[PDB]
Write a protein that binds this DNA or RNA. Structure first.
Lengths: 81, 216, 141, 97, 54
RNA sequence: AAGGUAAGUAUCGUUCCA
């Protein structure tokens, strides 16, 4: 089954004319915002540490604050006692 | 007098198997060797109880997604499932945790169920307002005893006699009592002088705190 | 605290000051286990994303990097230093010390206030900026 | 800070050391979301979350909520009794109340 | 290496001077925190079992 | 004892130090 495209005047398959009208009128300036923010996030640099860095910092913090971590309590800044 | 008029009524023998040092600070290999040491294993800790304690699930702390602020109703058998070898509770204390599993080896003529509603948090004491769905004239406890002891008792069924219900905060409370008049079945509610023959459903609806049974 | 990027040796912090030209480098010198340093290392967490455009935050443990203690007076438990284009931006507070914020604060808006004021005064080309709030007291009453 | 740090430390500690450790920020965001949901009194039920992670997060939320309630009431007592408190302290305490 | 020896001598002298009640004060604080660790436990072992269950 | 440093650009002197 063939229909006629309202915008281009060319024979088109009847099965596609729905998404043909959805996509043949794709707004041209939409392409930049699709291709602009993604580039911004691609070039964007992270703010927080990588997860392994959080893990290591957590280990180092646990090394000192024995009032919370560990089983052998010691001073706030002392490694072990 | 190891056995007096009140001891042979509420006291029952109880078995406890306790393991210690399951602490996560120990690595896997060290804990494997520790349990291999044969020093830290289940132990013979049989003693006596004047009353069985009941530990409830914590309050939901969140609204249910469909019906907000849903009332937490838990069957009694879930609570009583603590007293068997299947389940074991971690009564952690001080540095090392203590994993204890409970067991019953002598059912007293009357079984007392105290309920741990009031508990202290890290900062302030609160209450656990978890309602319990519990029968009053038919319950079976035979699964909680070893068979080498189950043969002794031909009566493991208990009927409720008295019930304790508490009101409000710990610092502002008003106890109420559900008493069963034996011979009849009239359950009466007494707070200070109150007298009211309630139905056997208001006993289930309210949150119990101390329950009295009878093995018959 | 632990979420923000950390610097381990003396070269890294100097590079972090040098590896930027269009923002402000806000360095929290101190010990992340300190009760004081942990009070404001969560304020610096809550605003790290917000000030991404004109501020980058690095954390430094003075014990791990014992190279700037003598020169920048790292003896208060917690210190905050602002750098712009490899230039320490002095900031005039209500306190006598005008080179650092040696106390941990509580409000997530005031720190963005101070950082944006520093950026605004650094684009002009100043060396000492003036904070909006006065810290000669605590406004407690 | 100490309670949240301990919770994250335990969760990341028993979390496998693979490449999956990239999910630390995910765990922190889950903790923050659960705390917000309790603060907002809104149902919080992550579908795909494991039951041990969910149990630990519930315990974290309960502990921080107990401390939150106690601290809010203590600060209110300080303010009503006439003690010397800050403006931001008053704002945060009013929000909590 | 005389400067290091002098510094060590003075540090050892000061450390000797704190032995007037060091062994008693440290033992007292050790026993004192253990009474505090009963009512107010540590957070990590408050999450000990759940950490194990993870 | 404080909460009272304007930030800069210049030649000149000195001194330790590499």
């Amino acid at each position: 089954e063939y229909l006629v495209s309202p915008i281009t005047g060319e024979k088109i398959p009847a099965s596609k004319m729905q998404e043909h009208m959805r996509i043949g009128l794709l707004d041209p300036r939409w392409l930049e915002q699709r291709d602009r923010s993604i580039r911004e996030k691609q070039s964007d640099d992270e703010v927080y540490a990588p997860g392994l860095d959080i893990e290591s910092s957590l280990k180092q913090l646990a090394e000192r604050r024995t009032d919370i971590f560990g089983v052998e309590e010691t001073a706030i800044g002392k490694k072990i006692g | 007098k190891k056995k007096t008029i009140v001891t042979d009524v509420f006291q029952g023998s109880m078995r406890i198997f306790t393991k210690k040092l399951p602490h996560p600070d120990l690595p896997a290999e060290e804990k494997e060797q520790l349990l291999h040491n044969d020093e830290y294993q289940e132990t013979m800790v049989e003693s006596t109880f004047m009353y069985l304690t009941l530990d409830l699930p914590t309050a939901p702390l969140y609204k249910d997604e469909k019906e907000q602020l849903i009332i937490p109703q838990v069957p009694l058998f879930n609570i009583l499932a603590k007293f068997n070898g299947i389940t074991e509770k971690e009564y952690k204390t001080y540095k090392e945790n203590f994993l204890k599993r409970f067991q019953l080896t002598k059912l007293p003529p009357y079984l007392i169920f105290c309920i741990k509603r009031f508990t202290k948090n890290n900062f302030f004491v609160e209450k656990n307002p978890t309602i319990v769905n519990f029968p009053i004239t038919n319950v079976d406890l035979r699964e909680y005893l070893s068979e080498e002891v189950q043969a002794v008792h031909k009566n493991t069924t208990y009927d409720l006699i008295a019930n304790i219900v508490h009101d409000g905060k710990p610092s502002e409370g008003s106890y109420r009592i559900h008493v069963l008049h034996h011979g009849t079945g009239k359950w009466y509610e007494l707070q200070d002088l109150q007298v009211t023959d309630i139905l056997p459903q208001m006993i289930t609806l309210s949150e119990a705190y101390i329950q009295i049974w009878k093995r018959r | 605290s632990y979420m923000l990027p950390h610097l381990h040796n003396g070269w890294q912090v100097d590079q972090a000051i040098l590896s930027e030209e269009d923002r402000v480098v806000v360095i929290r010198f101190g010990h992340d286990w300190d009760p004081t340093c942990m009070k404001m290392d969560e304020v610096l967490y809550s605003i790290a994303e917000k000030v991404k455009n004109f501020a980058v935050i690095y954390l430094v443990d003075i014990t791990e990097v014992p190279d700037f203690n003598k020169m920048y007076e790292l003896y208060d438990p917690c210190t905050v230093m602002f750098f712009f284009r490899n230039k320490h931006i002095m900031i005039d507070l209500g306190t006598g010390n005008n080179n650092k914020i040696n106390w941990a604060m509580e409000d997530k808006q005031e720190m963005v206030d101070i950082i944006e004021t520093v950026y605004r005064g650094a684009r002009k080309g100043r060396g000492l900026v003036v904070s909006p709030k006065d810290y000669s007291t605590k406004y407690r009453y | 800070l100490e309670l949240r740090a301990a919770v994250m430390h335990d969760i990341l500690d028993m979390m496998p050391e693979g490449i999956k450790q990239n999910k630390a920020r995910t765990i922190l965001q889950h903790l923050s979301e659960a705390w917000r949901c309790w603060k907002a009194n809104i149902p919080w039920k992550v579908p795909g979350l494991p039951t041990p992670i969910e149990n630990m997060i519930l315990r974290y939320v309960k502990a921080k909520a107990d401390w939150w309630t106690n601290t809010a009431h203590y600060n209110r007592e300080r303010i009503r009794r006439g003690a010397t408190v800050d403006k931001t302290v008053c704002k945060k305490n009013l929000g909590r109340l | 290496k005389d400067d290091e020896e002098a510094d060590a001598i003075y540090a050892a002298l000061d450390k000797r001077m704190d032995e007037r009640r060091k062994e008693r004060r440290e033992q007292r604080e050790k026993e004192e925190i253990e009474k505090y660790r009963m009512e107010r436990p540590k957070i990590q072992q408050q999450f000990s079992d759940l950490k194990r269950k993870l």
